[PDB]
Design a protein that fits this description.
monomer, about 300 residues, binds 4-hydroxy-benzoic acid methyl ester, binds zinc ion, UDP-acyl_GlcNac_deAcase, UDP-3-O-acyl-N-acetylglucosamine deacetylase activity, hydrolase
Amino acid sequence: MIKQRTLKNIIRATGVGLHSGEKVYLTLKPAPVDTGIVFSRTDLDPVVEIPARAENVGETTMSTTLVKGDVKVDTVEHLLSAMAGLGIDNAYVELSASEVPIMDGSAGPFVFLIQSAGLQEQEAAKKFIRIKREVSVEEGDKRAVFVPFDGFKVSFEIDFDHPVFRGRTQQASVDFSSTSFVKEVSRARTFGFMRDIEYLRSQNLALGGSVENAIVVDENRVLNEDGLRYEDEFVKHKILDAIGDLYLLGNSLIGEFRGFKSGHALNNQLLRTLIADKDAWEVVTFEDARTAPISYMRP
Ligand SMILES: COC(=O)c1ccc(O)cc1
Ligand SMILES: COC(=O)c1ccc(O)cc1
Ligand SMILES: [Zn+2]
């Protein structure tokens, strides 16, 4: 069978929140079968756990925020993207503060830290959500859709009228049967506009933002001296965000996601609409990895 996976070993990292600018200690720990991804605020007494599930998304302003009452875990999407990309089902994510560290603004440092620790196959079938029928949500010119697909595929389109986007790839499709999450998507970074930073800081957004953890765009050029990792880095980052947002379903998808200018808010609304529309999906297992429509790297 395709087995559930957890971490082989505890691993530790230090960084700062993108939004809060606060220093944070991150610990990834192994978790038993059917735990899912559970975030833990270890700075609080008593400690507060928040499962990484669509129903715990409380705020979606410029990141996905998990919330239990007054307790928040902000910017979970880049770490959940890495976990979805490596096939991690079960893990405890301990944090010393209210926001996952931004690291280099991508999933690259997370995929490296996890593959460094190693993955552990567990003695239980991995459960997938197979999309059986179209489910779509719209708001204004934004759209997010699931359609049936025998595999996992993401298509995304952004539309920015900014000189730095003129004639640039604003649309991409990744089929994870053809393409490596790791080589193709994980290194795409968070991006931001100089003309926005005053408004954002006034909203307690991007307080930790800099060229060290983001592509900073200024009028006609990228400020980062060493430039882009990909010609289409911006749309690749939105695909990274979508994978992270969609992993709040709590299981890997067998289907296709298409986003048109979709962000954290509409991605979460798509998950809530799917969960409610029970005839559009089923839980499936594969008793032979070799005959299944998606494969994961050796652990
Ligand atoms: C100047 O703007 C920034 O530094 C910045 C960093 C990260 C963002 O997400 C947005 C803006
Ligand atoms: C939410 O993302 C996934 O379901 C997923 C499934 C297979 C992958 O290879 C990557 C992501
Ligand atoms: Zn992001």
